[PDB]
Amino acid sequence: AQSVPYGVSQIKAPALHSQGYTGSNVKVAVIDSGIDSSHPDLKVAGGASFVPSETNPFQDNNSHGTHVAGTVAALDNSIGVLGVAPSASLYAVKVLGADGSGQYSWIINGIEWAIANNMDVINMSLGGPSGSAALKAAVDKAVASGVVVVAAAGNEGTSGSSSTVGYPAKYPSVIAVGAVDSSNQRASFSSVGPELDVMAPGVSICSTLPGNKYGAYSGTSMASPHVAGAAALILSKHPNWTNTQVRSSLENTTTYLGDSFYYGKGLINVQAAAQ
Numbered sequence: 001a002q003s004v005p006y007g008v009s010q011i012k013a014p015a016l017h018s019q020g021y022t023g024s025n026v027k028v029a030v031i032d033s034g035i036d037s038s039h040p041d042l043k044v045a046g047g048a049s050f051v052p053s054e055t056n057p058f059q060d061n062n063s064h065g066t067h068v069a070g071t072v073a074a075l076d077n078s079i080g081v082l083g084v085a086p087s088a089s090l091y092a093v094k095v096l097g098a099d100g101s102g103q104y105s106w107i108i109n110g111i112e113w114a115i116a117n118n119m120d121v122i123n124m125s126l127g128g129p130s131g132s133a134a135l136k137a138a139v140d141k142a143v144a145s146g147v148v149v150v151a152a153a154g155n156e157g158t159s160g161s162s163s164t165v166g167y168p169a170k171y172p173s174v175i176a177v178g179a180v181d182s183s184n185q186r187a188s189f190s191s192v193g194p195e196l197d198v199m200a201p202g203v204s205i206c207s208t209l210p211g212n213k214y215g216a217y218s219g220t221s222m223a224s225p226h227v228a229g230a231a232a233l234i235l236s237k238h239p240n241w242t243n244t245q246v247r248s249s250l251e252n253t254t255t256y257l258g259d260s261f262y263y264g265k266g267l268i269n270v271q272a273a274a275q
């Protein structure tokens with residue numbers, strides 16, 4: 001009794017699953033609060049922890065990382081939910097603690113680890129109001145090394161005529177993801193700005209939670225993994241594509257929904273992006 005979350009269907013992933021493209025052999029690093037590797041609906045391939053006080057990357061004391069990982073790769077079996085790319089090798093890069101916050105050094109150290117270990121895709125469902133020379137350098141170095149870097153735009157809403165997109169999503173190298181609901185309308189919390197690239201489902205998203213549980217969360221943090229998962233599906237069909245060709249295909253085959261200041265290029269359609 002396996003349920004497919006609306007969001008997985010909304011970006012058209014099941015169409016690729018049926019063709020045999022499920023993200024096999026693609027390494028996706030979920031840079032977050034850790035992932036509960038004991039979840040029956042997840043298979044964590046590796047990981048590392050950069051939080052000084054939480055040395056086990058496979059222990060998610062928050063719940064954020066496990067939910068985010070489940071959107072990316074919850075297994076295709078007869079239990080729980082289904083992920084966007086269920087055959088992806090999932091890596092837990094724990095940079096946030098039990099309180100859901102982390103220090104930039106920890107996050108940057110996590111991005112660095114991801115580059116060194118050849119992650120194909122990096123998902124950052126995190127972000128702050130300020131950036132740094134070191135934060136830009138890390139995400140720029142990952143993209144130069146062929147990694148697809150996806151990040152949550154932020155949950156700051158609108159503000160006059162200002163961009164409310166956070167970092168690292170604000171850097172040109174990072175694909176910034178905003179959130180939409182089931183009806184393709186922008187979630188009122190979703191950050192806006194000319195830095196927004198794509199939109200993905202982000203309201204009441206059902207996924208995995210520590211302790212063999214399932215729960216729904218809302219935020220651009222939930223939108224982001226739909227796009228990191230999409231990137232993995234596309235690489236399983238076209239492993240020769242560079243990170244640049246993966247991003248172009250994603251941005252260029254979206255379903256146009258309003259002005260780009262609010263919706264980026266629109267809703268991703270991985271069926272059209274995978275070719």
Ligand SMILES: [Ca+2]
Nearest residue numbers: 075077079081
């Ligand atoms: Ca499942």
Ligand SMILES: [Ca+2]
Nearest residue numbers: 169170171174
């Ligand atoms: Ca960006």
